[PDB]
Amino acid sequence: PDFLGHAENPLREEEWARLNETVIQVARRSLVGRRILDIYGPLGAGVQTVPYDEFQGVTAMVFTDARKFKTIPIIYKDFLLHWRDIEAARTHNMPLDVSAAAGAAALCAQQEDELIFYGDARLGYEGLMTANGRLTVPLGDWTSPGGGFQAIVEATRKLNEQGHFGPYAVVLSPRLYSQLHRIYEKTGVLEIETIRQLASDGVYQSNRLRGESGVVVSTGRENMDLAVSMDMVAAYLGASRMNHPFRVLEALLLRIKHPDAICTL
Amino acid sequence: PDFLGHAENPLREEEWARLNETVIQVARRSLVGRRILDIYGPLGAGVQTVPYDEFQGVTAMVFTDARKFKTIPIIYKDFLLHWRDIEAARTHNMPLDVSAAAGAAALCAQQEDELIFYGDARLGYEGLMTANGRLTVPLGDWTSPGGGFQAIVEATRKLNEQGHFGPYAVVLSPRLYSQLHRIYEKTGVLEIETIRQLASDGVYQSNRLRGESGVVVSTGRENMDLAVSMDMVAAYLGASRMNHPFRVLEALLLRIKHPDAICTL
Amino acid sequence: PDFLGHAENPLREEEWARLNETVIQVARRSLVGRRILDIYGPLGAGVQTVPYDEFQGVTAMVFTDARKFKTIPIIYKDFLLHWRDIEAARTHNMPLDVSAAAGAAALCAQQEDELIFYGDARLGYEGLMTANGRLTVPLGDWTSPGGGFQAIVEATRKLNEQGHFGPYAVVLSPRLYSQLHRIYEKTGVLEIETIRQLASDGVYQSNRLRGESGVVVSTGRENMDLAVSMDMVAAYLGASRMNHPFRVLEALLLRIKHPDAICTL
């Protein structure tokens, strides 16, 4: 009967394909970090450590590669399919409900963006909001109509003088996004279109930022990367008590190879 | 073991293809000069001199081709891959990190744009900012709202009277770009849209220009060319001390076949 | 002529085999550390980081493998074969002189033993003489006939009470080795035979130890390992100026997975 037995992929190939498509699609729709960072290609699930810097190195002599090494975190969320649903979908209703997968993937991607913007801060992971040498600037009197473009211009000037010209990118909190998206306030048209023309790559909004945020970054690779050990895939754990629990995995590591292209408002 | 040996392409065909794709892609994204100049097709790395003018020529008689001849410069930047990384990527992590290639290509393309806009000025190379018979015009009181469009109009009029009508193109410094991109200042809408409609080919911004710049040019071929000896390719030098150093090459020459279509602000 | 050309293995397969045999043989004869430490098998030259501990680990949740990660050093020594010698040995004298390889390998193995016993101490590497939680004991009045066996017995008792019984091993400095190897001094026969019977694995002498040393360790695996990235092989660098320089490589890392089985005199 094949269901009075333990395990080894209760779902068929079509159902696995549908599940993976759903999880990948909702991840791609939700994630905002993966739209300004070039990704070090998918290395495979085997790797656990990746270099964090750039290779600039030159009786017996000993040579120790002194760049840096950091371990790759792993993000997961659990979800459960009832016993009878799979057995039905194998003969009964051809669709298999994958609502739980969508919910789990949404939570996982939200945690991913939170991890990129804020590091764990005690495990040693760093982030676009906590990187050392962050080029911090003050962003005060934002409520004044026309006081947000000034901070963006001074920030991009500070990055230009440090040697980092080229296309920029801006990630703003929802409140600041609305404030800059509502008013004209300086000379001409809405004071988010001028910033969008200044950034030349895009101005995005991230829900994970706190009340006041808004870093501008230099989108070029070799400034900041994103090591993808493996993209979001759904994995089967094992039939606990004749049900079927799964897990959606992801293993990303932000590496700030050059923390000069960061400027926090 | 193939790594206790010297040389001859440590990278496989797939890795070479990825490296060349990365370098070409970042070059194409960064370069601004190659968007207003038609390119004399890639001649191959063999050539070292190209004619700089147009052929208009008519006891024994001697005939000397008296047009002009100039040598083609070559732009390069070095980068280094560690020894173990290639050996790993051959069996371990399938990706090979090409961050260094991206950085080197960005620097090389920046130097390319600098070379086009400013010549070497002592090696004899000339440029859109230093060409003789440049049709120089004064650009003063730019800060006055509505004082930038006037200079563009007088410049395009000066080019029209010299016999060079047709589509134009404008390359402005970042400061002037923002100043014209921020204000309405004359009659109607933002005073960069009217200039964009006047130019009919595009108004671009180049980071390599100094504080005050902004030439307008006639985009037609036979007015100004761009001799491409070879596009940006990554070349392997030779394993110095069991590491692997590379070099990204480029050989371009701007030739101003007719310095009437230039006007510096 | 094949010698008016650059590179790619000037030596034939027989000569390479002889060279590798010589270097491996002298290494195996000289090394004393590899006789009390089980080796994590040769991982291949690709790997650069290995775990330093034992896996004991258990809105979305993030899991960071928190054991430890350390990079694998690399030990090398250079040697040079004259130009004409290889060309002769290809037709003239069938032997190729490999004296330089033997000297380089001896120096490399000496540095290896020094590295195992003393860590680099500033690069972060640790060693049987500097490990934290070392169970230090005082070894005074060694000159007194019969005062060396007492220290060994108290040290092995201290290890027994900590939970580490099983076979032991002892590594003594040359001076202490002679002192214990010269005198009877307690009850019966030479006071190095009783210690040898107590250790049950062997009492060895290492030249790299300073004046006063003599740790006793528990030889079992899972107490202390030795990660072998690659054994000593001779590698060819590249014909600099028509000569032929080589290099003998080695990449070992001592990992003290459990610094309870150490006791320094």
Added chain:
Amino acid sequence: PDFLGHAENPLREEEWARLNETVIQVARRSLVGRRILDIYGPLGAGVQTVPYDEFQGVTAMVFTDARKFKTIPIIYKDFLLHWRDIEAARTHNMPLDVSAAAGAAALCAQQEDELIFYGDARLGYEGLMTANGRLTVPLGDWTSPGGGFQAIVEATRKLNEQGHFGPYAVVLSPRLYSQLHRIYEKTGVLEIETIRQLASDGVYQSNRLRGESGVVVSTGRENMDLAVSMDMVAAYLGASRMNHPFRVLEALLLRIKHPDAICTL
């Protein structure tokens, strides 16, 4: 991907062979009981009860085999391999780390020797230190130089008068082993060589014995056996939460078929 699936031997045949070789090798090195007891051959994991005596047996009549029957204990220790390590070793580093297996096997073999020498004493299991009819003898004034050989001689005499001549074997505690291994103390040479010549099979040391111990036994089969249900093998339990837990099994039973060849000091 074969790792987004549950179970059925995550390790390949080579890795299983290496694991079993490591566990068996460390067991064989550590165990001291299996060096004086002939083993009733490996019966297979199926059996759970073995006879404990020797068959000496002769309206309807009923015949009940009245020898004895005892159940075979099972000794295990758990260890865990991380999720990513197996996936890496399948493509990345060819070695698989088996340190945990070595530690678990060492603990299991230590428990085995403890079980042989001391029975469970409440489950009914018996041992060379607790067997009834043990021929107990007093071993006092051991510290006196030459007072240990006397006890061994009187013990072997007591066994000889009981009808059990033939080769003997001696298992002594570490303290008594050192005391007899340090002094000459009677007539000639070290007072452990004479006992070794008296025993004719070997004098061994076991760490599991308490402060004062030292039985001498008659090594012949049919006096005392060792029923091996199955030797130490590593078994896979099942992927709990995408990790991989294992277990090393062993099922031995000491059976004292004739408790006359025992004499406790």
